[PDB]
Write a protein that binds this ligand. Structure first.
Ligand SMILES: [Mg+2]
Ligand SMILES: [Zn+2]
Lengths: 202, 163, 52, 190
RNA sequence: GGUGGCCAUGGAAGUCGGAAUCCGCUAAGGAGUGUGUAACAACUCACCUGCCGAAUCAACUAGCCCUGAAAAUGGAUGGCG
C-alpha cells in the first residue's frame, strides 16, 4: 500500500471529472457501511458514488492539465467530509428528489436551521402528568381522560434562534422530527454553474 | 404487540440453525417458542417432515408463526448448499473421516448456487459473486480437475446472461 | 444500589489503573512507565485486577 | 543541546489587565485579582502588545528541561485569566451503596462537614483554602460545588475532601464510596 | 456484509483453542486485536474517514545519573568540604 495504490486513485478521480460533467456533492456525516451498500444498489441504474479523503483537493491537478478553468469554483467546497456522485442520465432534480430518504430528523441542542417549527395543537399520548417539559416553558395543557393535550398553539422557536436542551428533548419525545439535512445534498455542479439549496435548486 | 398487549394476525419471524433429525432432548426453541402459543413437541416434530427427506448435516431454519402454526421452511445458506453440493450423503455414525473431506466439481452448480443466493448479496452480477461463493471453500476445491485458487483470477461465462 | 454513571465515576478513580509489577505502585491507564525511583522506572506494568 | 530560543505568546482578552512586576504576574479582570511569582523558573516575561494584547514568555539560552517550562508558565497565566474572568467550578458527586454521606458547609465555604461515610462515627472536617467558596448544590441530589478564582486552590480543596473520604482495609474495587470530582468547569461559560 | 463461514457444539455466528483463509460494499473495515460474553450483544481495536496544521516515529547503540544494592562499639573521596 501507497505510492502505487495512491497514484492509482488519482487516475480514477481524473477519469470521472472528464467523462462525467454532472457532479453531486454529498454530505454523509452519519452513515453505516450496510447503508451505502444499499444506496448504491438502489441507485445502480443511475449514479456513481465516489468516496475519498483529503486528496479530493486534487481538482487542481486535473485543472493543471493545461486545460480546464471553472474547476476553481469547486475549490471552496472540498472541506469537512464530502464525496461526489457522478451520473450520466441526469436530467435535473427528478432523480435528485427520489433520493431523499428517511433520516434526520435528529434534532440537537446548539443547532440553528430550517423554518419556523410548529407543534399543531394535537393530543400527545405520552404517560400521565408528563407536563414538566411544557410547564418549564409555558403552554396551556389539560388531562382530558388519561392522555395529555395542548389546548392552544404557537411557534416554539423561530428562524435564526438557538434551540435549548429542554426544548430539543421535548420535540424528539413528541416525535416531531425537524432540524436536519446531512446525508442528502450540499452543493451541485453542472457545467461551471453554482447552484445553492435556498430554494430554486431542484 | 403494542400499548397494552395486542397482536393482530400472527405473522412474526423467528430463525434457527442446526439439525440432526429434529431436537427433543427436553429442548427445541423455548424462550421465543413458549410465550407465543407454539409448543415444544408437535411444532418440533412437524419441523421434521419439511426439514427432511434430506437435510441431516446442519441447517438454517425460518419458522413463521400464524396463531399457533409454525411454518418449517429450510432457507438455503451459501456454505450449507456447498456442503450439500458434495459427493454427498454419508450422514451419522460414520462420517468419522470427518467433514474436511473435500472434492466436488459444482462447475455450473455453483452457478445454480449463486442463482439461488436469493437477494442477500446486493450483487455485481455473477462474475463477482461467482468469485465470492467460489472463494468461500475448504471442502470441495473447484471444478473436476482444478482448484478455486485459479478461477478467482479469471470466469468466461454467466456475466451477461444473469443481468 | 449505586447508579451506573455514578459508579463508573468512582471506578475511574479507584479501578482502571495500571500497576507496576516491581513496586506495586498504582498508575493511570496510559502509563508505559512507572513514577517511582525505587523500582528503576520500570515499564513492567499490568492492569489492576477488575473485581469479579 | 542548548536551544537558542523558545517562546510563546498568551493572548490576553480585553476584559483583563495583567501587569507584571518584573517576573511576578498580577492579573485583574471582572472577578477579582490574582498574583503569582515565577521567581524560580527564570525566563523573560515581556508585555509586548501595546493597548494590552500579549504576554510573551521567552526562555533563551535553554536546554531541553527548562524549554519545557516555557509552556508551563504560559499555562498558569491562561489558567489565571480563565479564573479571573470566568472563575472555576469543580463539582463533586457523593457516591454509595448504603450510609448516606451527609455533607454540611459551616461558615461560608471553609468547613465541609461529613457525618456517616460508611457508618463511621468520626465526623470528618475539612478546611478549604482562602478564596474557595464551597456550597451544597441544588438541581441535583448528592453534589458539592467548589467555586473559586484559583485552580490551584480549588483543586487541592476538591482533593482534600476527595481524599479525606477514603476507605481502609477493604476492596476499594468493591467499596466505591466517598466524595469525588465529577466535572471541572467554570462559573460563567460565555 | 457474502455470513450460526469452517473446525470444533461446551460454547466460539470475528473471537476457551486450530486449518486457516477469500470476495462484495469497496472507502474501509482482519471471516478479526482485544473487552468480555455460555454464545452474542454492547463496546472496543486494526482498516478507513471527519476536524486540524509540519515536522513525526520506531528499534538499536552508546555517553553521563537513577535502580540491582541487605550487617552488627559511631562514621569516613584522607578530612574538611
Ligand atoms: Mg479484609
Ligand atoms: Zn514501579
Amino acid at each position: 500500500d501507497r505510492a502505487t495504490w495512491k497514484s492509482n486513485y488519482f487516475l480514477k478521480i481524473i477519469q470521472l471529472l472528464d467523462d462525467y460533467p454532472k457532479c453531486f456533492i454529498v454530505g454523509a456525516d452519519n452513515v453505516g457501511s450496510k447503508q451505502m451498500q444499499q444506496i448504491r444498489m438502489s441507485l445502480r441504474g443511475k449514479a456513481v458514488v465516489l468516496m475519498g479523503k483529503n486528496t479530493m483537493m486534487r481538482k487542481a491537478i486535473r485543472g493543471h492539465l493545461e486545460n480546464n478553468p471553472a474547476l476553481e469554483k469547486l475549490l471552496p467546497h472540498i472541506r469537512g467530509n464530502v464525496g461526489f456522485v457522478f451520473t450520466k442520465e441526469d436530467l435535473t432534480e427528478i432523480r435528485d428528489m427520489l433520493r431523499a430518504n428517511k433520516v434526520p430528523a435528529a434534532a440537537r441542542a446548539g443547532a440553528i436551521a430550517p423554518c419556523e417549527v410548529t407543534v399543531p395543537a394535537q393530543n400527545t399520548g405520552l404517560g400521565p402528568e408528563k407536563t414538566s417539559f411544557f410547564q418549564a416553558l409555558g403552554i396551556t395543557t389539560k388531562i382530558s381522560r388519561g392522555t395529555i393535550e395542548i389546548l392552544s398553539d404557537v411557534q416554539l422557536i423561530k428562524t435564526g434562534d438557538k434551540v435549548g436542551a429542554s426544548e430539543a428533548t421535548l420535540l424528539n419525545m413528541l416525535n416531531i422530527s425537524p432540524f436536519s439535512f446531512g446525508l442528502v445534498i450540499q452543493q451541485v455542479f453542472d457545467n461551471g454553474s453554482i447552484y445553492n439549496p435556498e430554494v430554486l435548486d431542484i | 404487540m403494542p400499548p397494552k398487549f395486542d397482536p393482530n394476525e400472527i405473522k412474526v419471524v423467528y430463525l434457527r440453525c442446526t439439525g440432526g433429525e429434529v431436537g427433543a432432548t427436553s429442548a427445541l426453541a423455548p424462550k421465543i417458542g413458549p410465550l407465543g402459543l407454539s409448543p415444544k413437541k408437535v411444532g418440533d416434530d412437524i419441523a421434521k417432515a419439511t426439514g427432511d427427506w434430506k437435510g441431516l448435516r446442519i441447517t438454517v431454519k425460518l419458522t413463521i408463526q400464524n396463531r399457533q402454526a409454525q411454518i418449517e421452511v429450510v432457507p438455503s445458506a451459501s456454505a450449507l448448499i456447498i456442503k450439500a453440493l458434495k459427493e454427498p450423503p454419508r450422514d451419522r455414525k460414520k462420517q468419522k473421516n470427518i467433514k474436511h473431506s473435500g472434492n466436488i466439481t459444482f462447475d455450473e452448480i455453483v452457478n445454480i448456487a449463486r442463482q439461488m443466493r436469493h437477494r442477500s448479496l446486493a450483487r455485481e452480477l455473477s462474475g463477482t459473486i461467482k468469485e465470492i461463493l467460489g472463494t468461500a471453500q475448504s471442502v470441495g476445491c473447484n471444478v473436476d480437475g482444478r482448484h478455486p485458487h485459479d478461477i478467482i483470477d479469471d470466469i468466461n461465462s454467466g456475466a451477461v446472461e444473469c443481468p | 444500589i449505586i447508579e451506573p454513571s455514578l459508579r463508573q465515576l468512582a471506578q475511574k478513580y479507584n479501578c482502571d489503573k495500571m500497576i507496576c509489577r516491581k513496586c506495586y505502585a498504582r498508575l493511570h491507564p496510559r502509563a508505559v512507565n512507572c513514577r517511582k525511583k525505587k523500582c528503576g522506572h520500570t515499564n513492567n506494568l499490568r492492569p489492576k485486577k477488575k473485581v469479579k | 543541546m542548548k536551544t537558542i530560543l523558545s517562546n510563546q505568546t498568551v493572548d490576553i482578552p480585553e476584559n483583563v489587565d495583567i501587569t507584571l512586576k518584573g517576573r511576578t504576574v498580577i492579573v485583574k479582570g471582572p472577578r477579582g485579582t490574582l498574583r503569582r511569582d515565577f521567581n524560580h523558573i527564570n525566563v523573560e516575561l515581556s508585555l509586548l502588545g501595546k493597548k494590552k494584547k500579549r504576554l510573551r514568555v521567552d526562555k533563551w539560552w535553554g536546554n531541553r528541561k527548562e524549554l519545557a517550562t516555557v509552556r508551563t508558565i504560559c499555562s498558569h497565566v491562561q489558567n489565571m485569566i480563565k479564573g479571573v474572568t470566568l472563575g472555576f467550578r469543580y463539582k463533586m458527586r457523593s457516591v454509595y451503596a448504603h450510609f448516606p454521606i451527609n455533607v454540611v458547609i459551616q461558615e461560608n465555604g471553609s468547613l465541609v462537614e461529613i457525618r456517616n461515610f460508611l457508618g463511621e462515627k468520626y465526623i470528618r472536617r475539612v478546611r478549604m483554602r482562602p478564596g474557595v467558596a464551597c456550597s451544597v448544590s441544588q438541581a441535583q441530589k448528592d453534589e458539592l460545588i467548589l467555586e473559586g478564582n484559583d485552580i490551584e486552590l480549588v483543586s487541592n480543596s476538591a482533593a482534600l475532601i476527595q481524599q479525606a473520604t477514603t476507605v481502609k482495609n477493604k476492596d476499594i474495587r468493591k467499596f466505591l464510596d466517598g466524595i469525588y470530582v465529577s466535572e471541572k468547569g467554570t462559573v460563567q461559560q460565555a
